[PDB]
Nucleic acid binder design. Structure first.
Lengths: 48, 162
RNA sequence: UCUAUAUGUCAGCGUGU
DNA sequence: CCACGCGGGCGGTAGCGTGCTTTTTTCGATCTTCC
DNA sequence: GGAAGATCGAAAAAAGCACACGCTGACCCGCGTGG
């Protein structure tokens, strides 16, 4: 849940981001890239 | 003998790595397609590669060492399984040379006549039907009011695809 | 007590032990 | 010169590290013991 | 006479390293890309 990984305001106009958010973003980006590559009928080495 | 290897390149540095490798006189292959991207809202015809951030370099390790290619500017790392770097068979290279698809890309999601959500200005958070950039930096949409939708041109960077 | 004032870590220290 | 939006080890046409103790797991080399 | 199990020292990986409090600084993506 987002509250357990809050995006606390930085009081200077920025946002302090927890490491869990970065890990989730990386996982989501990798999953989306793999989905696109699979939908593109990519060869064996690239998809592996 | 010359062999094929797969290289992961840095984000947006494929071209620079390509020129650097061509400077070192090693043959390289990368899928290439010219098509219509939106590019921050301005519908333009430019070239992007299939399987982004990937290159196929044909070279002999005897002539030039693997670590030299690994240290080439613009190249992130060799695509390796296990300790040794992966070897791309010639059949895959042939298929890639015949591999010619026509598709679209995620930045190119909004094409003529589809649903686009405006999230800025006096019309923030609404849905419209987008058809065409007029000129380059001006795109119009079927802006929706309480009664009906009317065509009107708004700034390109304000709206995003659903 | 959701009545004020409502972040985190890293580094350097110091205090009582 | 004012946003911006995704890979990320960094940077480079290589190498960076480098002053603890205890417990657990596994491996190469041997061995040794037999059926 | 070769395989099986076995064992034994050595190498690699994992987990831990007291409590409480007070203070300071230093961030809390950078960069090729785009307009």
């Amino acid at each position: 849940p987002p509250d357990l990984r809050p995006l606390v305001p930085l009081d200077g106009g920025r946002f302090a981001t927890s490491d869990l958010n970065d890990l989730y973003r990386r996982v989501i980006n990798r999953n989306n890239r793999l989905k696109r590559l699979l939908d593109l009928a990519a060869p064996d080495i690239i998809v592996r | 003998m010359q062999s094929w290897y797969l290289l992961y390149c840095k984000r947006g540095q494929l071209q620079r790595a390509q020129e650097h490798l061509e400077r070192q006189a090693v043959n390289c292959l990368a899928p290439m397609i010219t098509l219509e991207k939106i590019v921050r809202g301005k519908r333009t015809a430019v070239s992007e590669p299939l399987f982004p951030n990937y290159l196929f370099v044909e070279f002999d390790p005897e002539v030039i060492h693997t670590t030299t290619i690994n240290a080439t500017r613009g190249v992130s790392h060799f695509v390796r399984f296990g300790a040794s770097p992966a070897i791309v068979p010639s059949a895959v290279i042939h298929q890639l040379s015949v591999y010619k698809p026509k598709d679209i890309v995620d930045p190119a999601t909004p094409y003529p006549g589809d649903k686009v959500i405006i999230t800025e200005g006096a019309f923030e958070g609404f849905q419209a039907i987008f058809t065409e950039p007029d000129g380059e930096a001006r795109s119009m949409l079927l802006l929706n009011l309480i009664n009906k939708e009317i065509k009107h041109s708004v700034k390109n960077t304000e709206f995003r695809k659903l």
